[PDB]
Design a protein around this nucleic acid. Structure first.
Lengths: 122, 114
RNA sequence: UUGGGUAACACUAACUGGAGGACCGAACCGACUAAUGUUGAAAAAUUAGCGGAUGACUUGUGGCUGGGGGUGAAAGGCCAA
RNA sequence: ACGUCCGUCGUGAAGAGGGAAACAACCCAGACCGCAGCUAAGGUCCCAAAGUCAUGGUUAAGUGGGAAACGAUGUGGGAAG
RNA sequence: AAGCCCGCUCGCCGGAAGACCAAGGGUUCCUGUCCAACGUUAAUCGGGGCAGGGUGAGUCGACCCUAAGGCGAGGCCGAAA
RNA sequence: CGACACAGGUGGUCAGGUAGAGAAUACCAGGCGCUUGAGAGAACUCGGGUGAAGGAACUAGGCAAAAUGGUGCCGUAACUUCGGGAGAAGGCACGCUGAUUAGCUCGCCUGAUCAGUCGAAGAUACCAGCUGGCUGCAACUGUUUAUUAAAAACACAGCAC
RNA sequence: GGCGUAAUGAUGGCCAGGCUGUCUCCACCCGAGACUCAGUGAAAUUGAACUCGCUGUGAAGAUGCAGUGUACCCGCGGCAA
RNA sequence: UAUCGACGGCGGUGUUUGGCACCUCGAUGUCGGCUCAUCACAUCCUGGGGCUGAAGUAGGUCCCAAGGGUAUGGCUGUUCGCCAUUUAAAGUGGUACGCGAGCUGGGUUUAGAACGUCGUGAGACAGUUCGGUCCCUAUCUGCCGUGGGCGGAGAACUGAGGGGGGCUGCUCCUAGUACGAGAGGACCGGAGUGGACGCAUCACUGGUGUUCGGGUUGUCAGCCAUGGCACUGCCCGGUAGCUAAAUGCGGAGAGAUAAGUGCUGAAAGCAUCUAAGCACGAAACUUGCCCCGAGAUGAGUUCUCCCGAAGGAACGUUGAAGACGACGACGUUGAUAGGCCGGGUGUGUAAGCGCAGCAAUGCGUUGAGCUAACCGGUACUAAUGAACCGAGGUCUUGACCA
């Protein structure tokens, strides 16, 4: 995942697709892996209710195309890409429910609330 | 580099080619003379060629006239030079290298058929 | 030209006819960008691309006009590298 | 602006030889030949040829050589309330 | 004798390295004997060197005439190519 | 002809020899092997064929490369000197095999029907437009530096003196 | 000559879809070679000497000045100060 | 006098600019960028410190430090600018404003043309704009690597010196706690992990193949089957191996100093970190560690090989070797290579016939054939003979032995 990329949403904030802008705490030739918070600007969504289409918010990558290897030696790969929008409240999804599975290292050690809402875990 | 495979003394085409001919030479005349890489690989053009052409039948005589384009020394390979090598496996037609000749310095034996 | 509507003016449909320094092209024509070549055959060629293509076209042979000339849709361009 | 134009000096000019480490101008001193002696330049402990020479003193810094506006009871000497 | 010749096998070209010709070149064609010289190797090979032979039409072409145009003669202009 | 047996240049006839949409590839006839060699699976180019993901981000400019790119059916906008633009765009079909219909005198001619059937791909092997929008300039074809500029330069019908 | 303008134009700038190595970075392979061997065999190019290194100096980044140190011969391949 | 700091005075640097023409215009073609090789420091964060408008906290300014990291776009040909989204940091200067016999050329200083301005004008204008070439098979020297010889040789080693980096962040055990009315908002050490730069190795995951298998067009062998040619025809896939978005590994500690903190102790019988002495004290220094390495002038060592023979170069068959050379193994006391067989693999259903079927080719017989640059067994085949380089135990001179 790099800048100006298009990924799908996992939460229900009224947004459909998202256009990756940049990552927080990462200066490299285009990049944004799973677990890395990145500020973006959704593209397709609901232009009403609350100015959504056009605003720039923060999100957390959950699934990507790139395959990551695990301690056992097996690599996992997904179709496209997805992310979850978060608000100002220190790491807190804006939506209510989340769609799509999640990793393990993204639980215990790091987020403990995102897992509580995770309907699937690989 | 890598392991030792075949040996294309020239290019690709010049390299099936060459094998055929100078292959039917060791069935038309029990004496041939090439070079160093000579018939060392032609020892292969012949057996394969013998066997699968050992016992006379339909699914053998054809394989013969497929590598060697000739009717004269394709039938003689049968009824002669077999049944003539009946109870003998391998050792079809070997040969011991010979000193190089004039012109292009290159040692060459004389295939022969034992 | 035929048929139909209309008075006519003309119009519509079909058919016929097929022009047009028109477009794609056999043979080929032109030839923007680069590399090769640059004591190349020597007076400027090769390769990968690229564009335009029956006429005011192209071409052989013969003939006519010459230097301060002529000629020139003038580029100071051409008049035997 | 790697000047025009004056002045002093000095060289490039017409200069040896020679020291200054090397050097156009600083110091001393001026080319025949071969040869002998004694001096100058400078050098004189060794390579290097010549006294590790005489009297007296300073510095101790190895300073022996870039170094400044400015500071200092580092130290020595002298005068005065 | 790796590139002179024979057989076989393996390929190239087809508006083309095929067939017939213009211009131009010009005997370079063929045969025999050789190769010192020529052939970007060698050569018993040659469009190479030497000596011979070959191009026997009334109806093929030349020869003849004419187009743009040109020349000579008379006429007319210091003079005249 | 170009100094040379210099991949340069040079007129006419053979464009029905055989297979396709043709004077395109493969191949009889005919001709030819007269465009220096031998051995080793470097670094080191020019020629050449495209890459997993992204994809012009390179760049003066996507130059270069690639892509669309046969045929038949359906369908096709703005604009217009209604001639056109339009093979606009867009979409589908297009293999083979068996048995047949229709047009025609017939074709080793053409257009279709039904059924069966194979591959990832059926114009599965010979070409070949990428499309679209905005803006500058010139009208266009044509003409122009034979040896670096063809361009908004030149010319042109028309208008005027 | 000002303004403005269909169709066309290998004209200049710019944006989108699709696509592409053009780029971010890049593996090997194929044909013809390079490296070596038989045969055939030029033309370009040079004041002399010449293996330096470390400092210093010099118009303050000379191998060739000054002071020291040092330096074994030849050969192959490259990227090239 | 605790940031700021006028007037005035005194200096340093020379990155800026103006610029006194001895140097080059018998010419070191122009700016910037680009690409490529080599040699350094007046720095933003982090680290260690000084001042403080330093109460604390948070900041301002200055010194030190490269150790790591400075990896990107849109308009313009433009260099130093409008701007955007990130970034803990993403300083600066020299190298004939390093670098074109390394690249790129987009710019400027050519033949066309357009435009303004100047001119009546051609034409002009260090005014602008569109299009427009930048060469050479390095001989020497230097450097990066590889060899042959010389100091009698084969094999096995050593090895002075030479080359080298670590930094940052997240999380857990401990803070939204200490401090503070509130707002606001800090701290050893031991560990796990997130970003990165440094010898190799791949079994695992993945990328590749003119080995191989399949489909298919033209054409030829009459057809079928099975094949040749377009030097895999074309299209699809793909093993080994090499590789990759792969994997394993990459200290601590010790010693000596700077800033600084102290001890003992004078000059000034007090005091004082010093002046003599002395205890501690930095990611930096040396070493440790890894790599290169006798052309490292202390230019090495070892054993054995020529001191009339105690070997070696040449040769033959092959590589755990390799551009030439070298290097390494074997040479019958042989398996080194090939053949055969087997093992381990790649594909995928055979020839023929029966019944198949009009046929393409659909079926049954065959979950059958064909093929391989692995390994093993096995010498069955192929590693002979013979020649040759070749100093000959150089001296003056200490102990022991006889």
């Amino acid at each position: 995942i790099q800048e100006q990329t298009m990924l799908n949403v996992a939460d229900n904030s009224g947004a459909r697709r998202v256009m990756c802008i940049k990552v927080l705490g990462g200066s490299h030739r285009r990049y944004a892996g799973v677990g890395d918070i990145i500020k973006i600007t959704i593209k397709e969504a609901i232009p009403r209710g609350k100015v959504k289409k056009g605003d720039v918010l923060k999100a957390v990558v959950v699934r990507t195309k790139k395959g990551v290897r695990r301690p056992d030696g097996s690599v996992i790969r997904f179709d496209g890409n997805a992310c979850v929008l978060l608000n100002n409240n220190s790491e807190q999804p804006i939506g209510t429910r989340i769609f799509g599975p999640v990793t393990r290292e993204l639980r215990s050690e790091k987020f403990m609330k995102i897992i509580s809402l995770a309907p699937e875990v690989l | 580099h890598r392991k030792s495979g075949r040996q294309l003394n020239r290019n690709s085409s010049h390299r099936q080619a060459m094998f055929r001919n100078m292959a039917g030479s060791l069935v038309r005349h029990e004496i041939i003379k090439t070079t160093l890489p000579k018939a060392k690989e032609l020892r292969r053009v012949v057996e394969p060629l013998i066997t699968l052409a050992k016992t006379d039948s339909v699914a053998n005589r054809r394989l013969a006239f497929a590598r060697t384009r000739d009717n004269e020394i394709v039938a003689k390979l049968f009824n002669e030079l077999g049944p003539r090598f009946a109870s003998r496996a391998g050792g079809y037609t070997r040969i011991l290298k010979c000193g190089f000749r004039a012109g292009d310095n290159a040692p060459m034996a004389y295939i022969e058929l034992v």
